Ligand binder design. Structure first.
Ligand SMILES: Nc1nc2c(ncn2[C@@H]2O[C@H](COP(=O)(O)OP(=O)(O)O)[C@@H](O)[C@H]2O)c(=O)[nH]1
Ligand SMILES: *Sc1cccc2ccccc12
Ligand SMILES: [Mg+2]
Length: 166
């Protein structure tokens, strides 16, 4: 059956691991080693079509490695994650976006922009400015909380739809 290869990228601490573990294991893990990169696989059903998701939860020290480049070439879609209380992580999106397009040598790569930690009160990044950036990229924007589950399945499933459309 169909497999979708997803790569979760973004600055350290934005919640890549928390998002991935919430999606797969349905619980919020609050102090997951920042240095661990790993693959999470799970069978799921999406719009009826039964699926295998292969999700790469990236670690920052691997950024310029030959292995990262191969993983990006293999990856079919990218969840580009920032935190809504961390402006720098939002500004880093530009960097990850350009890297993915370069490494995969394409201007149209399946992607979703994710603004995580939506449960936190101290917002520094407006939804509108994230929506504006996503529009400029021509990709969906989904706001999530790995802690509460809000938006998590939508983020990942929407990325699968983006891969289908491609
Ligand atoms: N309140 C809240 N905390 C979060 C959320 N996602 C991650 N965190 C916390 O933010 C920190 C970094 O999360 P982590 O998943 O390790 O980030 P990574 O470096 O992108 O893998 C951890 O302390 C998590 O508990 C969220 O949606 N809400
Ligand atoms: S989850 C996983 C494991 C190995 C290689 C991958 C490439 C791209 C996406 C996900 C991967
Ligand atoms: Mg992590």
């Amino acid at each position: 059956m169909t497999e979708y290869k997803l790569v979760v990228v973004g600055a350290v601490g934005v919640g890549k691991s928390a998002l991935t573990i919430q999606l797969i294991q349905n619980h919020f893990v609050d102090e997951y080693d920042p240095t661990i990169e790993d693959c999470y696989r799970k069978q799921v059903v999406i719009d009826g079509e039964t699926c295998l998701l292969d999700i790469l939860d990236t670690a920052g020290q691997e950024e310029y490695s030959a292995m990262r480049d191969q993983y990006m070439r293999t990856g079919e879609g990218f969840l580009c994650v920032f935190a809504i209380n961390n402006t720098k992580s939002f500004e880093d999106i530009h960097h990850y976006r350009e890297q993915i397009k370069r490494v995969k040598d394409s201007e149209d790569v399946p992607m979703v922009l994710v603004g995580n930690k939506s449960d936190l009160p101290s917002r520094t990044v407006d939804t509108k400015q994230a929506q504006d950036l996503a529009r400029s990229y021509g990709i969906p924007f989904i706001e999530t909380s790995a802690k509460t589950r809000q938006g998590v399945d939508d983020a990942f499933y929407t990325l699968v739809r983006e891969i289908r459309k491609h």
